[PDB]
């Protein structure tokens with residue numbers, strides 16, 4: 126008697142992007158939406174969804190995607206802050222960057238615009254690879270993008286809707302959810318990249334008690350599986366400790 | 374001017390279960406659907422979806438959920454083989470077991486009916502915890518369920534639609550995707566349980582070369598993060614090796 130739905134291995138999306146944002150400030154988010162539509166993210170190419178933090182912290186960096194993903198219909202799902210704005214590069218640029226990455230390295234799972242190169246040799250300085258306009262300067266670069274990374278800045282990242290990666294359930298807050306996503310991508314057997322897709326990010330990092338707390342939680346959690354590793358993020362290196370590193 | 378959708382933190386599902394099966398044989402799947410409807414999985418409570426392998430191996434154990442989950446609307450998503458059938462315990466018993474688990478340990482992320490207890494002390498025998506009717510006997514038990522486990526038998530497992538866990542991308546095939554899902558649940562900071570929900574699984578243990586291939590791949594992959602661990606599955610122990618265990 127039940128009538129089942131048979132599901133085939135086919136990408137039946139017709140929208141290229143689901144653009145999801147973590148929204149607290151209506152004015153910043155309206156700026157973002159206007160800029161995306163101006164730079165080619167029109168209704169036949171993209172839909173916009175917002176995790177609604179306008180009245181309080183209903184969601185945080187590690188939980189918002191689990192609610193957004195089921196509602197997305199696009200091929201690629203962007204998870205970005207409310208305070209990015211497209212300024213020059215647009216829809217065709219982003220498609221071309223993603224398709225180029227698929228060709229270069231089909232093991233990618235997460236892509237962003239700023240992050241730290243994968244497994245830096247030199248732990249005496251923080252490794253960075255990005256191209257962006259932000260509070261540190263307009264149209265600036267570190268390193269060379271595109272390139273493989275071990276962490277991404279949370280202002281803008283993306284994954285394929287049919288090949289997602291999830292954030293941890295045992296951390297909560299508004300720091301380190303970009304690195305956590307990259308690390309889970311490695312556990313799942315894929316990779317993270319910073320691509321070259323220049324946009325403007327207005328926000329400033331907040332090195333507050335939550336930042337210090339989550340830095341310690343990241344080290345306590347990840348040292349179990351990456352003992353001795355020094356994890357680079359745009360916000361600074363994190364010596365995870367553990368194992369033989371604890372001698373001294 | 375885009376019109377965004379604002380998303381709130383609420384479970385809007387009206388169906389309790391999305392029952393997803395990996396299907397190659399129509400007669401076995403018809404028998405499954407008949408049994409689920411008989412034992413209380415009516416259209417007001419459950420929908421049924423099939424990863425369609427009737428014509429070829431379009432999906433395999435580690436990929437099928439990524440196509441199924443977007444199509445599910447139920448609170449809990451069951452992933453089962455086509456050759457399980459309900460025979461005594463039904464809809465109300467499963468709901469009661471999941472609600473009890475949620476009360477006992479809110480950290481759970483995946484549940485199944487047969488698996489190996491979490492971190493067994495005694496590696497001289499394979500740890501098992503199950504209650505099932507299968508090729509090894511009708512109405513049989515090992516161990517004591519419900520209990521936390523480090524692996525689950527793939528014949529039937531479930532997760533919350535809104536708190537999923539993903540299988541790896543860098544393995545493919547039809548063995549060890551129950552253990553892989555439990556290990557990724559640990560990486561995500563949650564837990565796996567075998568619950569008491571008796572059903573009939575009529576698969577055979579029919580041996581293939583892919584079983585040994587995936588056993589080796591699982592050891593090569595997980596030894597990186599779990600060096601020295603002996604991972605128990607109802608199909609046998611797997612010494613992952615790695616680290617100090619390599620000393621002869």
Ligand SMILES: O=c1ccn([C@@H]2O[C@H](COP(=O)(O)OP(=O)(O)O)[C@@H](O)[C@H]2O)c(=O)[nH]1
Nearest residue numbers: 395396397426430454455456547576577578
């Ligand atoms: O080449 C294969 C082998 C198996 N299966 C599916 O993988 C699952 C496990 O198969 P089966 O139940 O026959 O194995 P058993 O439980 O006897 O070990 C079932 O859902 C099958 O439909 C598949 O799609 N292709």
Ligand SMILES: [Mn+2]
Nearest residue numbers: 206208280328
């Ligand atoms: Mn920001």
Ligand SMILES: [Mn+2]
Nearest residue numbers: 454456528576
């Ligand atoms: Mn079976």
